[PDB]
Amino acid sequence: QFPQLDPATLAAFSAAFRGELIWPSDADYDEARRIWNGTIDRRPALIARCTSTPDVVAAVSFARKSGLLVAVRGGGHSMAGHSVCDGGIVIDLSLMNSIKVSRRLRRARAQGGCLLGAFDTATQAHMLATPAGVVSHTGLGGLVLGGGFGWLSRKYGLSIDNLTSVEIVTADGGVLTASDTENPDLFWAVRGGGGNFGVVTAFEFDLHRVGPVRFASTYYSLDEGPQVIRAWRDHMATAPDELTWALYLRLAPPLPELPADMHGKPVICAMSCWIGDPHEGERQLESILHAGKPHGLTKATLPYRALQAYSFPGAVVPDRIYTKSGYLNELSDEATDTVLEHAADIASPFTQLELLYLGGAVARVPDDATAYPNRQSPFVTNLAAAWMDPTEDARHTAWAREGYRALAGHLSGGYVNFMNPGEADRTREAYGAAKFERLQGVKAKYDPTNLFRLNQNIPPS
Amino acid sequence: QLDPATLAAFSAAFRGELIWPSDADYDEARRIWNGTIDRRPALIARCTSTPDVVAAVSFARKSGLLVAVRGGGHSMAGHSVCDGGIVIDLSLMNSIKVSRRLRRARAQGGCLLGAFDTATQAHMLATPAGVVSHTGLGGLVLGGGFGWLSRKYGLSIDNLTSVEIVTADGGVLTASDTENPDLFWAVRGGGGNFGVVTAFEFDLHRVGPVRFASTYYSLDEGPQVIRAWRDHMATAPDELTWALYLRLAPPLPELPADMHGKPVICAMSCWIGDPHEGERQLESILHAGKPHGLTKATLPYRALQAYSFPGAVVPDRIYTKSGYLNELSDEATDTVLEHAADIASPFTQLELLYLGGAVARVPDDATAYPNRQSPFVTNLAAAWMDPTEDARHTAWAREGYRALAGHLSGGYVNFMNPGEADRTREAYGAAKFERLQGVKAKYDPTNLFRLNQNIPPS
Ligand SMILES: Cc1cc2nc3c(=O)[nH]c(=O)nc-3n(C[C@H](O)[C@H](O)[C@H](O)COP(=O)(O)OP(=O)(O)OC[C@H]3O[C@@H](n4cnc5c(N)ncnc54)[C@H](O)[C@@H]3O)c2cc1C
Numbered sequence: 001q002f003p004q005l006d007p008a009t010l011a012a013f014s015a016a017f018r019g020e021l022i023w024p025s026d027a028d029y030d031e032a033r034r035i036w037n038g039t040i041d042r043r044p045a046l047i048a049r050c051t052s053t054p055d056v057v058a059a060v061s062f063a064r065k066s067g068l069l070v071a072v073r074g075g076g077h078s079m080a081g082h083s084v085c086d087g088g089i090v091i092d093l094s095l096m097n098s099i100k101v102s103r104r105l106r107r108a109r110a111q112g113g114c115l116l117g118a119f120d121t122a123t124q125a126h127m128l129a130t131p132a133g134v135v136s137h138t139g140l141g142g143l144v145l146g147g148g149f150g151w152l153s154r155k156y157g158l159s160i161d162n163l164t165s166v167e168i169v170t171a172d173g174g175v176l177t178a179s180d181t182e183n184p185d186l187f188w189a190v191r192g193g194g195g196n197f198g199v200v201t202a203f204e205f206d207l208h209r210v211g212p213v214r215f216a217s218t219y220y221s222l223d224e225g226p227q228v229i230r231a232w233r234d235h236m237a238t239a240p241d242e243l244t245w246a247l248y249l250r251l252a253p254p255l256p257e258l259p260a261d262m263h264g265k266p267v268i269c270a271m272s273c274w275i276g277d278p279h280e281g282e283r284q285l286e287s288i289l290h291a292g293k294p295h296g297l298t299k300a301t302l303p304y305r306a307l308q309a310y311s312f313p314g315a316v317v318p319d320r321i322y323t324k325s326g327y328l329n330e331l332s333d334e335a336t337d338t339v340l341e342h343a344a345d346i347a348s349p350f351t352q353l354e355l356l357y358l359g360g361a362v363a364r365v366p367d368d369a370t371a372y373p374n375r376q377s378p379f380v381t382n383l384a385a386a387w388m389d390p391t392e393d394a395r396h397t398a399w400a401r402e403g404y405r406a407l408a409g410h411l412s413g414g415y416v417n418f419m420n421p422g423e424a425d426r427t428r429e430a431y432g433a434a435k436f437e438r439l440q441g442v443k444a445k446y447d448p449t450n451l452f453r454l455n456q457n458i459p460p461s
Numbered sequence: 462q463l464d465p466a467t468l469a470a471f472s473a474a475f476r477g478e479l480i481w482p483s484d485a486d487y488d489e490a491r492r493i494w495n496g497t498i499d500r501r502p503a504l505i506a507r508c509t510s511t512p513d514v515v516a517a518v519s520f521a522r523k524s525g526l527l528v529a530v531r532g533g534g535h536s537m538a539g540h541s542v543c544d545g546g547i548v549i550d551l552s553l554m555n556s557i558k559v560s561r562r563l564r565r566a567r568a569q570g571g572c573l574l575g576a577f578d579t580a581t582q583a584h585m586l587a588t589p590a591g592v593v594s595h596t597g598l599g600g601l602v603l604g605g606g607f608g609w610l611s612r613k614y615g616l617s618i619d620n621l622t623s624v625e626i627v628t629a630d631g632g633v634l635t636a637s638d639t640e641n642p643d644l645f646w647a648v649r650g651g652g653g654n655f656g657v658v659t660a661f662e663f664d665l666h667r668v669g670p671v672r673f674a675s676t677y678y679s680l681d682e683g684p685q686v687i688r689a690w691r692d693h694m695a696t697a698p699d700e701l702t703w704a705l706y707l708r709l710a711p712p713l714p715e716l717p718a719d720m721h722g723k724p725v726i727c728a729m730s731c732w733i734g735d736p737h738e739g740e741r742q743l744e745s746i747l748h749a750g751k752p753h754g755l756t757k758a759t760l761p762y763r764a765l766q767a768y769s770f771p772g773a774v775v776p777d778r779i780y781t782k783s784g785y786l787n788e789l790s791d792e793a794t795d796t797v798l799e800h801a802a803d804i805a806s807p808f809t810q811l812e813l814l815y816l817g818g819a820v821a822r823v824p825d826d827a828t829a830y831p832n833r834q835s836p837f838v839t840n841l842a843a844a845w846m847d848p849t850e851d852a853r854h855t856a857w858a859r860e861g862y863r864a865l866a867g868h869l870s871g872g873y874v875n876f877m878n879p880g881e882a883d884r885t886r887e888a889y890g891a892a893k894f895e896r897l898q899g900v901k902a903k904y905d906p907t908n909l910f911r912l913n914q915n916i917p918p919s
């Protein structure tokens with residue numbers, strides 16, 4: 001956190017940089033360096049809060065010239081802690097949050113530091129939307145570069161399936177456009193290849209008209225887990241793209257809609273929505289709500305912005321997290337029993353074992369069309385441990401590790417955006433050999449010195 | 462047609478985008494939410510920083526261009542676009558910094574409410590603002606700003622601690638309780654009259670999940686619902702907010718199909734506090750008539766903010782008449798219900814709101830916001846799509862307002878329509894209006910900022 005810093009380079013950077021600099025002696029340093037995964041505590045030499053593409057160019061050049069370890073930060077949600085470094089520079093894009101939306105063209109151009117809810121607000125101003133993740137304060141930047149999935153994905157694909165171009169600052173300080181017509185090698189790689197290839201200062205998306213959505217959330221007792229999970233797995237194998245249905249095994253929240261004797265006990269929280277006519281939606285959801293006895297059932301017809309803002313209603317933001325995730329091509333009865341066994345052991349009220357079903361529009365894109373791997377595996381499991389007290393890290397981490405080990409033979413690949421700080425070696429497996437090889441060649445062209453290595457990293461060559 | 466060296470000085474000092482009448486994106490850029498207002502600016506300046514705003518303000522002053530300022534473009538009066546002048550468009554200045562420790566947010570003057578609410582809510586924090594996510598923070602806060610958190614935490618301006626503002630002479634000032642407090646008084650309720658606010662600083666509160674209910678009552682049961690509402694609100698704890706919106710029932714699955722498109726009371730309510738207590742409180746106010754299409758939920762505050770309005774449709778054309786009530790009498794109730802029965806467009810609402818609570822505890826002279834002591838607000842909010850039907854919808858709101866004028870006083874600046882320039886004095890009252898004219902004579906003596914509910918200097 002105290003490297004040299006040639007005064008002339010530094011003075012060149014300062015005069016070229018219009019944003020804010022934050023040094024270790026500054027009052028806002030400690031708040032500035034905190035990211036969502038509170039287990040990651042690192043002290044950068046410097047935090048540069050960029051406010052424009054020229055700022056990012058200055059910060060990249062300054063980092064390269066000074067040999068500072070480069071962290072890039074969009075929303076700070078890295079489950080691996082990638083967006084803060086010890087002793088280097090954080091290129092922090094959090095003030096670059098502008099969105100321009102054309103209603104006529106159904107287009108959005110969004111800066112690299114945007115939060116999901118800010119983008120959703122902007123597009124919903126015109127009844128428009130495009131897929132992103134389900135928690136409003138996640139960053140658009142990291143989420144999109146890894147792929148990006150949420151409520152609209154079965155219908156409209158990953159975030160990267162609606163991305164048409166990026167403005168990107170490469171390690172040599174160049175500003176490039178990448179799209180289907182301009183640097184398409186780079187455009188393939190940023191659709192899935194993370195922050196490996198440079199800093200994206202603007203993303204352009206095609207939008208869709210999305211009016212109110214019929215939604216339901218309910219809880220089932222763990223008693224009924226086998227029949228609920230079998231009903232879910234079997235229904236989704238043939239469900240219309242319009243239906244999304246996700247299971248979250250957790251301790252029941254102390255909420256008035258739930259009976260007192262369920263509070264704090266493991267349950268299955270099922271959330272579902274219908275993207276399309278809300279009357280059809282009401283019939284479709286009613287037909288999946290009764291696979292177990294529903295408790296705490298909430299049904300609403302929501303603007304899409306409000307469905308985006310809904311996940312997940314709790315009283316405190318978890319400070320500490322640890323995740324282990326993989327895909328499955330199929331969810332066998334043995335895998336289902338394992339999931340339920342490990343959910344009965346959840347300790348924290350903030351922990352969830354997520355069972356997600358993608359497929360739909362995500363699976364109809366050709367494997368090779370982007371860097372995102374595993375389109376053909378429909379199931380995603382995520383053992384997402386979350387808690388508050390740092391003296392309990394081992395008990396929570398052990399829960400995620402042991403549930404994963406017990407499943408791992410059934411799992412393949414892994415979403416880069418769900419990797420934990422210890423999973424740097426999962427990168428080849430996540431991508432597979434063919435994608436990994438093509439990603440390396442693009443890395444050798446655009447970032448041959450690996451200036452961008454705080455990511456699920458692809459070494460060049 | 463502009464002086465070439467002035468123009469060239471501006472362009473040199475300006476790091477944003479300029480949009481000219483010949484640009485393909487001009488027609489989209491110049492449209493505002495009130496689509497009855499169709500105007501053609503000489504130039505649109507899309508500002509990206511406080512130095513850009515300084516360059517635009519100085520360029521307009523020097524060229525003698527009429528200045529429209531645009532935050533979120535929600536002006537009910539159409540103020541955020543002009544014919545022949547310059548639009549200083551702040552929509553790209555959307556950045557927000559939140560301190561969890563100090564419970565503080567600094568937001569730029571072009572933020573939308575949903576961007577602000579997302580940023581605050583990442584820390585479980587919030588501060589009072591409007592109920593529709595894509596409204597502009599800029600215009601809303603400068604006129605006062607009320608919504609779900611107001612009865613508990615006051616108006617938006619009651620949580621504001623300082624602003625950065627660019628004045629008509631091109632200067633950048635801080636205004637707060639300790640620096641330029643005459644200006645700080647005026648910007649809290651005096652709208653965009655005193656300059657372009659480029660950053661707002663707010664105190665925040667911790668807001669976790671909120672119990673919420675929305676439901677629909679038949680107009681058959683209208684008299685007893687609205688009386689139960691006016692009676693209950695007179696003694697309700699700050700934590701309870703309850704609003705009534707008379708409107709055509711939206712075609713949603715929670716309502717039986719026979720009610721769709723017929724006049725109803727939509728009642729929305731929330732408890733800012735413990736969701737168990739919230740459940741008991743909302744139950745106690747949900748049964749004055751039979752609730753149809755009841756939705757009850759425990760929501761993050763961000764999702765409550767994103768929920769309004771049921772049907773989630775954007776109307777193209779709008780016309781509003783609003784004022785305050787000190788009391789809602791049985792006679793005024795009958796009137797409301799009679800006009801409500803005549804609503805034609807599925808987008809129109811006759812809104813009955815109840816502020817009071819924390820808003821009314823602030824001394825009347827602490828800010829430029831008038832009528833803290835009148836708890837009721839009615840807003841005849843006509844909205845429609847077809848340009849050939851303007852006159853019928855406009856007449857609905859005018860005739861309802863006329864029919865209730867014996868009960869109505871003042872008016873919220875932020876609910877004024879484009880024909881209501883004459884209503885400014887009655888809105889503020891003599892004393893406030895006179896104080897505001899003196900602040901205008903000091904900070905905007907040439908009235909460079911006159912596309913607003915305008916306060917002439919002197
Ligand atoms: C509460 C929560 C909910 C989530 N829900 C979902 C979900 O529903 N679906 C889903 O797909 N994912 C989800 N995620 C995962 C999210 O996709 C990853 O955590 C993603 O990396 C977050 O991006 P960010 O910008 O917030 O993170 P950061 O930590 O800022 O960055 C993550 C990575 O991206 C790089 N990066 C960030 N922005 C840029 C940019 N503009 N240019 C170049 N590189 C950049 C960083 O260098 C780092 O490698 C969620 C995460 C959280 C914390």
Ligand SMILES: Cc1cc2nc3c(=O)[nH]c(=O)nc-3n(C[C@H](O)[C@H](O)[C@H](O)COP(=O)(O)OP(=O)(O)OC[C@H]3O[C@@H](n4cnc5c(N)ncnc54)[C@H](O)[C@@H]3O)c2cc1C
Nearest residue numbers: 530532533534535536541570591592597599600607653658
């Ligand atoms: C659909 C809808 C829902 C609404 N709900 C509510 C609500 O729940 N509560 C409530 O209080 N109000 C509400 N309003 C009204 C809102 O307060 C006013 O329409 C407000 O003026 C909107 O501000 P804006 O920046 O979007 O509008 P704009 O049209 O961009 O501007 C409005 C006025 O403010 C000036 N201005 C805007 N930003 C700045 C700035 N940064 N500096 C200086 N001057 C500026 C403009 O010159 C103009 O006079 C709502 C409006 C709409 C359209």
